[PDB]
Amino acid sequence: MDIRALYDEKLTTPEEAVSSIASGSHLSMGMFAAEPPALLKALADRATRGDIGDLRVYYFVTAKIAGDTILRYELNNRIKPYSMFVTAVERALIRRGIEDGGRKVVNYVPSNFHQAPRLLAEEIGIDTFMHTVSPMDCHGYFSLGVGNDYSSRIARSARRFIVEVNRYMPRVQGEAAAIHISEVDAIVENHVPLIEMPVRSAIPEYTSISHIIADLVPDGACLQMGVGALPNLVCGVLKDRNDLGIHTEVLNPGLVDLIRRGVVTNQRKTLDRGRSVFTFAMGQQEMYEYLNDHPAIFSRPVDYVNDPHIIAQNDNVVSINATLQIDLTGACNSEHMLGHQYSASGGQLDFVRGAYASKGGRSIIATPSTAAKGTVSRIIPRIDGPVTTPRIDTHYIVTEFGAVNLKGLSSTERALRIIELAHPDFRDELTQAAKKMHLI
């Protein structure tokens, strides 16, 4: 194929690239750092000029990029967020919609992340897909870079695929990560640094927690970690380990550090031996650079990564996830918003199940015992409404005061052992509550 010719007959401006997108259609985009700033700004401008309406945008993990363009509150009447996972950007929109006469401005779409490819391709249907990509190579291929997730599927199943070439986007190897230019409908170029996950400082509780978790990581553990200061600290403690593998949902700076140190070899994995596996990546510039052309890092779609049966096929999986609350039944809650559950959509539960099913595997859910300078307990009597991790799935829980394996324990054994993980200031109160609920 004459790729140079193909590039030039597809290359165009952001404004022109989004101008044929139909009103009343379905659009989706890449996660996080794969959200295309130039294309989304141009699309936002269309809505501003009143040149498009009734556009549903389906997506999972959003950033300032979409937040400052197509998802601005003012465009809400023309570009409709159909969020399948609610983060801070949606929290602000929903809050503001309540203020503004009780408007519903975010349309939550309950879903399983590991089913995202199918859900978007078949149940929902996507007309236009937009994604930042690495520059075309000499064979005519782009790469989805920090993204695979649902994106490697929808880039093919969507009726139109528009790419935003960025040199700051790493060239990443992975299943269906490479896209030939013949599979692309339009191209724009916008070379800008990828947005970064803000680094958060550790709190004192994370020191004890990270050491308790470290003792629970066996030899040749196959790691999955969410983002945050706690996981990063844990990786810090694992810097003296050997022959660890990676099979994670999110690839973060902590895990990449273990790769760079040679702690991670993936030689004890059954699947994807010799390669670290992820579905999408979040970090800072240094991590993003490191991913470029890395031969031992291999992205795969979320329907592989987050499939509990796939996760379970590696021995000694250790899944480390954070949560905001744990109740006395062992149910856990990761959703910030009061009265609601939009967090259940996330792939956390997939690894809770997968890690337990792994031979030698451990699912860990960890949290500091208190919040707000010790005045609020994160160990509570009962979670309000639907939960993030049901009590029948929870394996290990950790606070700064220890760990408990809940599997096989009665309601009473659970409550008595969970209370001992609460801060001393709250254990009496939790004990009374447990009695009232007739757990003990």
Helix (H), strand (E), coil (C) string for 349-410: HHHHHHHHHCCCCEEEEECCCEECCCCEECEECCCCCCCCECCCCCCEEEECCEEEECCCCC
Using the structure block, give the residue that is written with the tokens 């989805």. 144
The sign of the torsion formed by the CA atoms of 92, 93, 96, 98 equals negative
Q: Calculate Rg over the CA atoms of the chain.
A: 22
Displacement of CA 187 from its chain's centroid (Å): 27
DSSP designation for 251 = E
DSSP string, 186-217: EEEE---PPP-PPP-PPPTHHHHHHHHHHHT-
CA dist 152 and 131 (Å) reads 10
Report CA-CA distances (Å) from 316 to 20, 88, 264, 359: 50, 34, 14, 6
Catalytic hit among 249, 335, 420, 429: 249
d(CA 340, CA 237): 35
Experimental method: X-ray
3-state secondary structure at position 277: strand
Closest alpha carbon to 87 in 270, 260, 307, 345: 345
Residue 115's φ and ψ, nearest 5 degrees, are -105, 5
Distance CA 238, CA 226 (A): 16
Amino acid at 345: S
CA distance 96 to 410: 43
Three-state DSSP class for residue 161 = strand
289 assigned to active site: no
Q: How do beta strands 55-59 and 26-29 pair?
A: parallel
Query: HSE (CB half, 13 Å, CA atoms) of 261?
Result: 19
**Exposed/middle/buried for residue 388 (C-beta within 10 Å: 0-12, 13-18, 19+):** buried
Fill in the amino acid letter for 333: N
- Cβ atoms of 107 and 82 within 8 Å: the answer is yes
In the chain, domain spans: 1-440
Contact 21, 128 (CB under 8 A): yes
Question: What is d(CA 372, CA 423) in angstroms, rounded to the nearest whole number?
Answer: 13
Across 419-438, b (16+ Cβ under 10 Å) vs e yields bebbbeebbeebbebbeeee
Asked whether 44 and 72 are in contact (CB, 8 A), the reply is yes
**How far is 182 from 196, CA to CA, in rounded Å?**
31
Q: Of 104, 112, 63, 53, give the one whose Cα is nearest residue 84.
A: 112
Q: What is the resolution of this structure in A?
A: 2.4
Q: Please count the other Cβ atoms lying within 10 Å of the Cβ belonging to residue 77.
A: 13
| Residue pointed to by tokens 């967090």 | 343
Do 90 and 106 meet the contact criterion of CB atoms below 8 Å apart? yes
